[PDB]
Write a protein that binds this ligand. Structure first.
Ligand SMILES: OC[C@H]1O[C@@H](O)[C@H](O)[C@@H](O)[C@@H]1O
Length: 278
């Protein structure tokens, strides 16, 4: 227990549906300088058991300096699959678990570190718990396999001021550039967000009636290939506020009425693992 941000340990939570392929569990938190272990368990129960079937047990140990991935079933654990723990007592943590048909995929600071092969049915994760020497600051889950080129309507009300669009993506490793488009009903692009890795810039621009306007670009490109990031398109009243990886990357004064931005478009060298309106 420390500064009440919320999220008390032990933190248990019930899943709406079972944990399907494409969906991701994301657990951020801060660690004290006296922390030895915390744990993440994708389990089932009975309503809530407290020791029955755990398809994916992650134990992060600062004493042993390794992340331990195991699976408790039929009363036992099995062969520990170990892996070097890149964390140091102190600093934040960023564990993100993605289910697939074949296996779990666990990634640290947005960098894949472990491909845990499914040992008992994934269909048995109905709960997840987080426990131990850790302060939890962010636990989110959801998502699906997002096909790219992506295209889809946004909600109904669309993205209007007071709403952010939250996109969790990962630029492809040998990819030169990708784009995201927030769209208006008539066709126009409200904001064209276009990280170009070749030009080492993130070009921002609007497409009005067939023709692209000026093109705003100042900004150290923060994305890195093969690494995943948290793109956030925060629609304020006078500008979008673009957030990359927790911090404001750039603002973009509206060149079009931010009301009724009801379409989304993601192209290029990128994998999309989460979309959500907020
Ligand atoms: O090709 C059209 C558009 O593509 C993007 O890469 C640029 O950022 C836009 O300003 C350009 O007009």
């Amino acid at each position: 227990m420390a500064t009440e941000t919320n999220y008390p340990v032990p933190y248990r939570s019930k899943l709406t549906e079972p944990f399907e392929p494409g969906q991701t569990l994301i657990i951020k938190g801060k660690t004290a300088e006296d922390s030895v272990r915390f744990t993440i368990n994708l389990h089932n129960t009975s309503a809530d058991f407290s020791g029955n079937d755990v398809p994916l047990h992650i134990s992060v140990r600062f004493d042993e300096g390794k992340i331990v991935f195991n699976t408790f079933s039929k009363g036992e654990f099995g062969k520990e699959e170990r892996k070097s723990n890149p964390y140091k007592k102190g600093d934040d943590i960023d564990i993100r678990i993605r289910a697939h048909d074949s296996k779990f995929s666990i990634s640290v600071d947005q960098k894949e570190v472990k491909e845990y092969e499914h040992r008992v049915p994934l269909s048995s994760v109905t709960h997840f718990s987080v426990d131990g020497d850790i302060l939890i600051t962010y636990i989110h889950w959801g998502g699906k396999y997002y096909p790219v080129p992506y295209e889809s309507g946004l909600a109904g009300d669309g993205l209007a001021p007071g709403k952010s669009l939250l996109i969790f993506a990962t630029p492809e490793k040998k990819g030169k550039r990708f784009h995201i488009n927030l769209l208006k009903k008539n066709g126009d692009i409200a904001l064209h967000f276009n990280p170009r890795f070749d030009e080492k810039a993130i070009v921002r621009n609007s497409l009005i009636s067939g023709e692209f306007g000026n093109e705003e670009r100042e900004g150290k490109n923060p994305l890195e290939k093969g690494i995943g990031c948290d793109l956030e398109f925060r629609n304020e009243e006078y500008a979008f506020q673009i957030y990359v990886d927790g911090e404001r990357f750039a603002t973009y004064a509206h060149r079009l009425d931010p009301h009724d931005i009801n379409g989304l478009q993601i192209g290029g060298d990128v994998e999309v693992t989460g979309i959500q309106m907020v």
